[PDB]
Amino acid sequence: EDTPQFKIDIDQEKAQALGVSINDINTTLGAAWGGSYVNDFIDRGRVK
Amino acid sequence: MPNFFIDRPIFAWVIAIIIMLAGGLAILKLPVAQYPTIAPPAVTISASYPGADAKTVQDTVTQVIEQNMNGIDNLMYMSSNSDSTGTVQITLTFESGTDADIAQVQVQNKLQLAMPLLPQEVQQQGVSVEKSSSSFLMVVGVINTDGTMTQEDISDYVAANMKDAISRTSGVGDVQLFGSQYAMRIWMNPNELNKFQLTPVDVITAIKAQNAQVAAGQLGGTPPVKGQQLNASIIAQTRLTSTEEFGKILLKVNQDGSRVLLRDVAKIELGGENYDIIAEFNGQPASGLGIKLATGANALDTAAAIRAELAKMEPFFPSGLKIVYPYDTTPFVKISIHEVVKTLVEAIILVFLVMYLFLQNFRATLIPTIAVPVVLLGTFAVLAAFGFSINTLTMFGMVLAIGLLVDDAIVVVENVERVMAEEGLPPKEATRKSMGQIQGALVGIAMVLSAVFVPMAFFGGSTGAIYRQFSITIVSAMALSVLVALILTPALCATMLKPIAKGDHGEGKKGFFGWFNRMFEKSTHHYTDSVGGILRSTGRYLVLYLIIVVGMAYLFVRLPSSFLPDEDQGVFMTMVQLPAGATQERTQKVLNEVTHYYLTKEKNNVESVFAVNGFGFAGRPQNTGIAFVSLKDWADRPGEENKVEAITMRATRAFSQIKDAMVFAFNLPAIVELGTATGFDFELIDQAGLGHEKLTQARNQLLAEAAKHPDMLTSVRPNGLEDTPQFKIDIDQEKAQALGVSINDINTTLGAAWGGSYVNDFIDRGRVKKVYVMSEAKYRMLPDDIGDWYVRAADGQMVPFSAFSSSRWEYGSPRLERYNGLPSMEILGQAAPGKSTGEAMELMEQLASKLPTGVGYDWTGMSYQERLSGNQAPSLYAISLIVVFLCLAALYESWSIPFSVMLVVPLGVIGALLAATFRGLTNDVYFQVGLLTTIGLSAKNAILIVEFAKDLMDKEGKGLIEATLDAVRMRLRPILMTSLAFILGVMPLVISTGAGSGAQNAVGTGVMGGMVTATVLAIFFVPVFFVVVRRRFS
Amino acid sequence: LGTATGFDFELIDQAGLGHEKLTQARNQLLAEAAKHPDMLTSVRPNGL
Amino acid sequence: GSDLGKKLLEAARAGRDDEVRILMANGADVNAADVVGWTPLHLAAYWGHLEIVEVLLKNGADVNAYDTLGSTPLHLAAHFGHLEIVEVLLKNGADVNAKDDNGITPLHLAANRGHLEIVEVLLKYGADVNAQDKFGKTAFDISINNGNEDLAEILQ
């Protein structure tokens, strides 16, 4: 069935006035709430 | 077996019914197309480097892909093009019989691994791998009459609202969009950019940032805090969906507080991805859909389904939008079937008349009327089993076989009618004795005709693919005819035919039939007296035989060779070629003049003109164009003066007046996917890294030597383009580093502005589409405009492009060709009138050996096909002749007697050559298969004469001349009956001038002329052959 | 098919021990294999 | 843009001596040019056709004619290493110190591709060795950057 969607809206001009890049804003929001795959590591001789 | 089915007529009827049902089932299920897969499996790798020159495309894309095309199965050769449109086409042609899907996936897979080696701009555009060997079923044109839509606007609607629905239609293989969907075009301004201290780099950076998908996450996503109630997806920034949104893209913020947007330094509108093509349909803007037929699909059903689905879209079209059908092969295939069905029905009607003319009873005339459809139905079932389609080649394969099918019916029934007349036996006993005389011969004839036709299937390449269609069709039709002649027809004769009194030849009757019987009986006595006179002085006819054999060999060399006859398909092409370096506008004016001619002068013939500016099959520069002329229906264009060939010659002579434009009209070939397939296709190869200039000098050296032999070579053109002036610009590194201007910013500003740059995607009404940034036309036309572009240095000052660059004029290739990995230049040409292709190819090899060091050559396309196909021919001719001899030797139980049969071959061939030479036709495939059927039926007639003559000498102990005279007396009636029916049967095909007339003329003329000589000569000459051979070898 | 009397053995690391522990386990197998000349002949590591 | 003029351009480019001879007799335009502004002499000098350069000059071809970017036939002859054509042009009064739009002389172009014999011929006919381009670089500055020991020794 149709689910509720939480539409956040980033103000880029207001962000540029305060002096923050949207790449940092998008990565911060994306990494925090959704998670972010950074790179691989070796857990007991297996890539994870 | 004949004796078995005479006592069991119901079991014979059961086999007849099973064949008819299997045949009837096949007719419903059998695929339908114009032509089958004839051209070898080809896979074209297509890529695009926007704003890239030929060398840039070659040295970053083409060479890299070529180097990675290894470990791919059944690859014959690889040819590629790299041109200044910023395009590459790498075509890998494969062995005949290779799986095109396995061929494509192996090429696709090796390309995928080479993608990281290509430039990012090429990877972003991406590379397509398609089958290029297939052809179009129809081209659906889409136009705008009210003039509210451009070609860009029409193309977008077709992509959005039509293409997908046409692709989902039943039997549709592939759909190509004649144009492109919308693209968000940012038309940059160097004056406005320099005003606010900005560059195309700043425009690209802003668009990438403010138009993109952003991953966010979820409210109450796993792992959650225990006691969480709500779980919802967080939606962040999605892609922009309008020109207004792109207009409001923020580039810079000034000290005073004013906002520098993207609409303040550029014009923003929905346009096309590429502006090279300007397609028009009778002046109006136009797009279209090239539709290809799916595998095993019915061409008649698919075309009807396409028209049905287009009808459903009618209410949803904008005002003034109309569908048109400039190219459609289905009407042609509709006539092709109707004419072949007519020929087969007329053939059965002519047998009914001729059977009633001689035998004079309705019960006799019904036996062929049942037997012939049973064989024809059965043939479709055998074609279905072999996986063949109902096409032009298979359909004319049936028509050429009619002569053999009709004979089997007449020979069996007529012989039964004769036995009843002479001996006075009842139908059942008469059929047993009649079949006893011919059953051995009919099996022998089957094996002889097998040895003639079966080896034709084992030719290699495109030629062998066509020969295979006729071979399997004729062998299958002939084979079933022999089975029906031994199973069904004997049962029908024994059950249906009435008894005839001894010595009753209808001489006691009155009227027309009474006169005919008395006339024919005396005509038979005149014939026997004539043959008697011939056999007294045989030596004189052996001299006349040699004159025919010398006359045959003479006409073979004189008659010019071709592939297939050019057909009036209701469409033809008119190429426009302006001088090198000529612009799109100059080409348009010539196309407008060409379109004006056809709508004015040929208004009674021409329906429409599809003027495609900046298009060509050997490169797509601005100077070249083409016009696809679509004609009215065949009924609306009566006479030879209103046909394509006549309109072509009138058009070409009219446009020769025009200056600064090479304009020629020309007809399509028979098999449009293959081409002309007449001349030769030569490749001149750089074998030792000489370079472009030295390969050009070597090409000019070969073309110069080719011109010195008009007697051998003619029409020798290179397929490539000539070098053109190009604007070389050298970026000074020291001056760029001194002023503090990065090379990335310089090369991006130049590339993005003048060439264009595909930035990222955007969503237009729920459809992903490209975003291009490029200079507005007026700021990138002339060398003076280079200085108007400014790039920002590190210190912030705007440096003009002139400050750190120097420019000059030089010559370079607008289209670089490569063959089998090395650089090449493709050269065309054909053999001079009188000379064969073999001689012309042999001289080109001799002239090639005298070219400079490190310059090699190779043969491609049909030249590669014919060289491998040519070597196989002697062996297949040899196998045919040897097995025919061996089969006849087993039949007669004699090594010498077979020669009496095999000496008939020239009697049929000479007439075909005279008819072709008189009417002025070529030695095409239709003619060549036509000879085999004429030779086959003439050989069949001779076999029954020799069998009867030999059986009289062996069993009844008669003398040589007595047996020969008694033999040809008995065989006179059935040979005249078959010939009278079959000559009248193919008469409509000779006089036909309508749709598919070229093929009908080629099939008809050769067979008619051949059958007239084969009938008239053989009745006199077969007596001579048998007596001379019998006398010579005891 | 290879040689007439030859065999091709593969010592596997199942529990994710490491390279050092597998080498020690390999040397233990080669050592015990050398103690039976009557059965096994020229039992050697294929790798480096 | 005459009919014979366009045929002379294509003939001079290809190097058809026999066709050029016929076109000079029929009175083909020697001062005819394409869109970039190249005369038959420009094309003949570029592709290195010695005979056609000699034939065109005898039929009153402009030796100091320049394209839309100011390049003369002496530039093209000097740049692409055609020693014979450079001598023939200079004998018929070719401007040895001819500057294009970028200030690049024939000496600069000959120096860049390291055509030693042509540099000596240009210097003989009075080539300004201290002539600078738009970036202030002499023929010597090109030789040291390219790393040509022989050329640097000659340009003393």
Ligand SMILES: CO[C@H]1/C=C/O[C@@]2(C)Oc3c(C)c(O)c4c(c3C2=O)C2=NC3(CCN(CC(C)C)CC3)NC2=C(NC(=O)/C(C)=C/C=C/[C@H](C)[C@H](O)[C@@H](C)[C@@H](O)[C@@H](C)[C@H](OC(C)=O)[C@@H]1C)C4=O
């Ligand atoms: C007067 O001689 C020229 C006519 C020009 O007029 C045009 C308008 O009629 C054409 C006809 C009737 C054609 O069948 C072709 C072309 C043209 C013309 O261009 C081609 N055009 C090009 C594409 C455009 N450039 C031209 C450019 C250099 C200015 C190269 C040629 N390729 C062309 C073809 N396919 C190929 O390349 C290959 C690989 C296919 C097979 C090759 C054989 C050997 C030829 O097909 C042969 C049977 C014959 O057709 C030619 C020898 C033809 O001479 C005739 C009519 O005998 C000349 C081409 C063609 O099949």
Ligand SMILES: CO[C@H]1/C=C/O[C@@]2(C)Oc3c(C)c(O)c4c(c3C2=O)C2=NC3(CCN(CC(C)C)CC3)NC2=C(NC(=O)/C(C)=C\C=C\[C@H](C)[C@H](O)[C@@H](C)[C@@H](O)[C@@H](C)[C@H](OC(C)=O)[C@@H]1C)C4=O
């Ligand atoms: C109406 O389109 C047809 C015209 C026929 O009429 C003729 C008589 O007029 C032509 C004209 C005016 C041409 O300029 C050319 C040809 C023909 C004809 O034949 C070619 N004939 C050939 C030479 C022979 N090979 C097969 C060979 C293995 C035996 C293919 C055809 N290619 C041909 C060319 N030269 C090339 O550059 C080559 C070597 C490659 C071209 C690549 C194209 C992009 C693809 O191959 C493919 C996607 C498609 O575009 C063609 C197949 C197209 O067919 C369709 C269905 O669209 C025909 C050109 C041509 O430039």
Ligand SMILES: CCCCCCCCCCCCCCCCCCCC(=O)O[C@H](COC(=O)CCCCCCCCCCCCCC)COP(=O)(O)OCCN
């Ligand atoms: C690559 C191209 C294709 C390759 C093709 C290769 C061909 C292989 C060679 C076969 C050549 C066969 C052609 C000659 C056939 C003549 C048959 C007539 C024989 C004959 O004189 O017998 C009379 C009629 O026989 C009859 O008519 C019926 C009775 C005889 C039946 C047996 C005949 C042999 C079967 C035919 C097929 C052979 C090939 C199979 C691979 C008397 O009759 P009778 O007194 O003998 O009747 C009692 C049966 N006992």
Ligand SMILES: CCCCCCCCCCCCO[C@@H]1O[C@H](CO)[C@@H](O[C@H]2O[C@H](CO)[C@@H](O)[C@H](O)[C@H]2O)[C@H](O)[C@H]1O
């Ligand atoms: C396109 C090729 C040109 C057409 C060629 C046509 C060839 C077929 C026509 C055969 C016509 C046969 O016609 C026949 O000829 C022979 C001559 O040999 C005549 O025979 C006559 O001369 C011979 C001489 O030896 C006598 O033995 C015989 O008694 C006498 O009647 C016949 O009276 C005549 O009926």
Ligand SMILES: CCCCCCCCCC(=O)OC[C@H](CO)OC(=O)CCCCCCCCC
């Ligand atoms: C009764 C003996 C007849 C045997 C004839 C066999 C010849 C055909 C061989 C074959 O398979 O090739 C078919 C071929 C395919 O193009 O068709 C043909 O080209 C038709 C054959 C031409 C006529 C031959 C007689 C003239 C001799 C100088």
Ligand SMILES: CCCCCCCC
């Ligand atoms: C509309 C005709 C379909 C059947 C094709 C086959 C007829 C021989």
Ligand SMILES: CCCCCCCC
């Ligand atoms: C006529 C072709 C076959 C030749 C072999 C038979 C000789 C008697």
Ligand SMILES: CCCCCC
């Ligand atoms: C193959 C033919 C041989 C016959 C000799 C009598």
